[PDB]
Design a protein around this ligand. Structure first.
Ligand SMILES: *[C@@H]1O[C@H](CO)[C@@H](O)[C@H](O)[C@H]1NC(C)=O
Ligand SMILES: *[C@@H]1O[C@H](CO)[C@@H](O)[C@H](O)[C@H]1NC(C)=O
Ligand SMILES: *[C@@H]1O[C@H](CO)[C@@H](O)[C@H](O)[C@H]1NC(C)=O
Ligand SMILES: [Ca+2]
Ligand SMILES: [Ca+2]
Length: 478
């Protein structure tokens, strides 16, 4: 019987003893909080009770590493998921609980998906506060309103109007175009980016809107606005179960009650409650169509979406897909079907799981129509499931802090060393853009850049005629 290296102690297995546990019940950094059942003990040397065997030596239990998705991380080695960091300390994952940047989203005709993940139905026909920071003791910087007309009982034909009020300006989203009714007092960080199917609005450093030009309206807030906003999109605090809090700080169990409390004009009437129809318009008493709609919308958890289903819950997009498609006479050309599915694929792509799902049979989209090679336009337009959203063009010469990584649609491809000119729909040399530069910032002709906004002695508003740059001092408002 040769001695064992400390602190391991030997275990002679007695055959004449009823039960015994040897090396078969060895405890490592993996199987510690588990139980063992030995057919017969294996004689050998094992670590003392307080320790576990790890890498052929006895280690303290607290010195055990943590495991994340199979990979081993030493104690102290942090992993970052989202905007939170998880430190490995004492064989445990200690994670921060910070609220990350969030997105409010209108899904489909009459559903809303709040910043904190609450999905509810609210078929209001008036104008409502989508998101605003005028809540109680308010700084009061921005207010975004949404008006729904035709998204009620007949949802086949519906149109929405979004009104954006920020920094003294009013930007309205309606009928697939952006209308800047009143400019922001400082346009330096204001951009209207048309990319693919979408229009991306930069409304300052921390407020953005992503819009598919029809009914998918998203507000992207940075986490500095947490607990500071209210309206149909909730209070943005990481707690989903309190987003149905009305304007009078009371939790409402019915979404129709919560939504009516955010009605803007007292002229129109509040929405009255209706019992939830599990089979709306064309699915009512039609088990055949309910099966067709369920099978079509079930693409959201099919193969191409399986990777994304782990990162982004498809349940709310699937509920909305089924509810809205039940208003279409045909699922092939159904607009509510493709838009809702595309809205999910868009969120997937923001999490690094770009999903190519369209086909010529199902929701086809091609760029062949606007590929005018033989017409004097030098630009090739190719569809991409997710291409960089904020590309440098003559109209956006400085690189932008884009609220989304990429978007779906048609994107122009230019020869090496050439930049897209959006107004001319053709590729041009970067020197040929009507673009000025000041303070290291390039801005397009007609854009106004404000230098030192808060400094009355150095505030300047710079204008770009074509390539001509002129700056003027600001006027003290008195
Ligand atoms: C994580 O660290 C904090 C201190 O930052 C401590 O209060 C908390 O108990 C730790 N949690 C775990 C599970 O180690
Ligand atoms: C889309 O663009 C990416 C780069 O942004 C490229 O790698 C990919 O091959 C493109 N796919 C299609 C179908 O154009
Ligand atoms: C630029 O503007 C100045 C006056 O501000 C004018 O004298 C000059 O001719 C302009 N140059 C061009 C190229 O337009
Ligand atoms: Ca909340
Ligand atoms: Ca620069």
């Amino acid at each position: 019987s040769l001695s064992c290296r400390p602190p391991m102690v030997k275990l002679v297995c007695p055959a004449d003893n009823l039960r015994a546990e040897g090396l078969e019940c060895t405890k490592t950094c993996q199987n510690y909080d588990l139980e063992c059942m030995s057919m017969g003990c294996v004689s050998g040397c094992l670590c003392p009770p307080g320790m576990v065997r790890h890498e052929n030596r006895c280690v303290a239990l607290e010195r055990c590493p943590c495991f994340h998705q199979g990979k081993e991380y030493a104690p102290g080695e942090t992993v970052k998921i989202g905007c939170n960091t998880c430190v490995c300390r004492d064989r445990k994952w200690n994670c921060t609980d910070h609220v990350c940047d969030a997105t409010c989203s209108t899904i489909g005709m009459a559903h809303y998906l709040t910043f904190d993940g609450l999905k509810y139905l609210f078929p209001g026909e008036c104008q409502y506060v989508l998101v605003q920071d005028y809540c109680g003791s308010n700084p009061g910087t921005f207010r975004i309103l949404v008006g729904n007309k035709g998204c009620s009982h007949p949802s086949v034909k519906c149109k929405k109007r979004v009104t954006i009020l920020v920094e003294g300006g009013e930007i309205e989203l309606f009928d697939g175009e952006v209308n800047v009714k009143r400019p922001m007092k400082d346009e330096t960080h204001f951009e209207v980016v048309e990319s693919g199917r979408y229009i991306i609005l930069l409304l300052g450093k921390a407020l953005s809107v992503v819009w598919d030009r029809h009914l998918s309206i998203s507000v992207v807030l940075k986490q500095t606005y947490q607990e500071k906003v209210c309206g149909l999109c909730g209070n943005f605090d990481g707690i989903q179960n309190n987003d149905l809090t009305s304007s009078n700080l009371q939790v409402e169990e019915d979404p129709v009650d919560f939504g009516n409390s955010w009605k803007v004009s007292s002229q129109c009437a509040d929405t009255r409650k209706v019992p939830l129809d599990s089979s709306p318009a064309t699915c009512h008493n039609n088990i055949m169509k309910q099966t067709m709609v369920d099978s079509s919308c079930r693409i959201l958890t099919s193969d191409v979406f399986q990777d994304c289903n782990k990162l982004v819950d498809p349940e709310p997009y699937l509920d909305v897909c089924i509810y809205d498609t039940c208003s279409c006479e045909s699922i092939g050309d159904c607009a509510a079907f493709c838009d809702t599915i595309a809205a999910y694929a868009h969120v997937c792509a923001q999490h690094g799981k770009v999903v190519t799902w369209r086909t010529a049979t199902l929701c086809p989209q091609s760029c062949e129509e606007r590929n005018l090679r033989e017409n004097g336009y030098e630009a090739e337009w190719r569809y991409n499931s997710c291409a960089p959203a904020c590309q440098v063009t003559c109209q956006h010469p400085e690189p932008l802090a884009c609220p989304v990584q990429c978007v779906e649609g048609c994107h122009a491809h230019c020869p090496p060393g050439k930049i897209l000119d959006e107004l001319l729909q053709t590729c041009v040399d970067p020197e040929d853009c009507p673009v000025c530069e000041v303070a290291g910032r390039r801005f397009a002709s007609g854009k106004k850049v404000t230098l030192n906004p808060s400094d009355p002695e150095h505030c300047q508003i710079c204008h770009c005629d074509v390539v001509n740059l002129t700056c003027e001092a600001c006027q003290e408002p008195g």
